[PDB]
Amino acid sequence: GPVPSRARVYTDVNTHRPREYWDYESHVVEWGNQDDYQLVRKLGRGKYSEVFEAINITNNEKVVVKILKPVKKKKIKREIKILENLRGGPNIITLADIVKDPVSRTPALVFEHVNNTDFKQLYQTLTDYDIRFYMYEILKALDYCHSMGIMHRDVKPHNVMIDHEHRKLRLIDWGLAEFYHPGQEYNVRVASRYFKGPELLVDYQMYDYSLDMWSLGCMLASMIFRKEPFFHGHDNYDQLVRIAKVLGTEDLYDYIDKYNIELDPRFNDILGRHSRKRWERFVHSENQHLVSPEALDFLDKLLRYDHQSRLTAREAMEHPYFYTVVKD
Ligand SMILES: COc1cc(/C=C(\C#N)c2[nH]nc(N)c2C#N)ccc1O
Numbered sequence: 145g146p147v148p149s150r151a152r153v154y155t156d157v158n159t160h161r162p163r164e165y166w167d168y169e170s171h172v173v174e175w176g177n178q179d180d181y182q183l184v185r186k187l188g189r190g191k192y193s194e195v196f197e198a199i200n201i202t203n204n205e206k207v208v209v210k211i212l213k214p215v216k217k218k219k220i221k222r223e224i225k226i227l228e229n230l231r232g233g234p235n236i237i238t239l240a241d242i243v244k245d246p247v248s249r250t251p252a253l254v255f256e257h258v259n260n261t262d263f264k265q266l267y268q269t270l271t272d273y274d275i276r277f278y279m280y281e282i283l284k285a286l287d288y289c290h291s292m293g294i295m296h297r298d299v300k301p302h303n304v305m306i307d308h309e310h311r312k313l314r315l316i317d318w319g320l321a322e323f324y325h326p327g328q329e330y331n332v333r334v335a336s337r338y339f340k341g342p343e344l345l346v347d348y349q350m351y352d353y354s355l356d357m358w359s360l361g362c363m364l365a366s367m368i369f370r371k372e373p374f375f376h377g378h379d380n381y382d383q384l385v386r387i388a389k390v391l392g393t394e395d396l397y398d399y400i401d402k403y404n405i406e407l408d409p410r411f412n413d414i415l416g417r418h419s420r421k422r423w424e425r426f427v428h429s430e431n432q433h434l435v436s437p438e439a440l441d442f443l444d445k446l447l448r449y450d451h452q453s454r455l456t457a458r459e460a461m462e463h464p465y466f467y468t469v470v471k472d
Contacts, residue, residue: 166225168323212252259309
């Protein structure tokens with residue numbers, strides 16, 4: 145059978161918390177006044193929610209209203225409990241209220257509004273200094289939620305809201321987030337394809353916070369190399385092949401051998417043999433202003449097959465890549 149794995153940090157945070165903290169199925173939702181919020185414009189629709197810009201008529205302030213699609217009350221209470229546990233943390237989106245929508249007959253989560261810069265304009269215009277700054281702001285949110293016993297499991301550009309005018313960042317959409325419990329096996333059908341960690345792609349279920357650090361590495365690679373997404377697989381199988389053409393197949397075998405994992409035999413015809421590449425190969429005249437030795441070493445230390453070998457969020461904040469970022 146597979147070899148078990150534990151997070152190397154924050155391993156026991158939920159065991160020493162009171163049970164109420166992580167036993168989300170027992171959570172009693174405190175409902176606000178649904179008439180306090182008037183929907184203004186539809187912002188988006190996802191797999192699990194519709195998102196609206198609204199006005200809170202008790203203060204005439206903008207808010208975001210996320211009307212959940214019908215799913216299991218467990219998944220709904222999970223997201224609510226996580227949002228309440230993390231409220232006030234650095235760069236965590238703030239849950240302001242929870243109301244019962246009378247049309248959907250589901251909960252509507254009400255959040256602080258972030259006046260977000262569209263991700264196209266952001267991606268094409270962020271400078272080297274901007275990228276280090278906002279990576280550090282994401283790391284603050286990830287170290288916070290990890291320190292609080294929670295992994296996000298859906299880190300990707302669309303879930304990082306940036307108000308570039310105020311240099312304000314918020315990590316959003318906690319609907320896939322989970323509590324980390326040592327030894328627990330989790331669903332591997334989390335994250336968007338391009339940001340799925342190797343552990344998910346080889347069906348290793350006993351993963352942890354380090355999954356978020358692979359996703360963060362994928363974002364960093366796309367930003368400094370100006371290729372979005374960086375690992376651009378056609379499906380979940382081709383996704384692992386794309387990764388192995390960069391990190392090499394020998395270290396992939398070392399990884400699955402360490403955890404006594406077996407690859408899906410359908411990889412036999414598609415995986416091939418691939419050397420590990422040096423990150424400099426991805427540097428060219430149109431991205432070199434975004435690349436430094438520090439950037440490449442930091443990236444190299446996030447994108448490891450072995451989830452146990454990646455930088456933790458706190459270790460990442462110690463990296464020389466952030467030495468030039470002004471600290472407050
Ligand atoms: C999809 O889950 C979430 C989404 C959001 C916010 C947005 C979306 N989608 C959004 N779109 N445009 C904006 N200015 C904002 C904000 N703030 C906040 C919390 C969530 O859990």
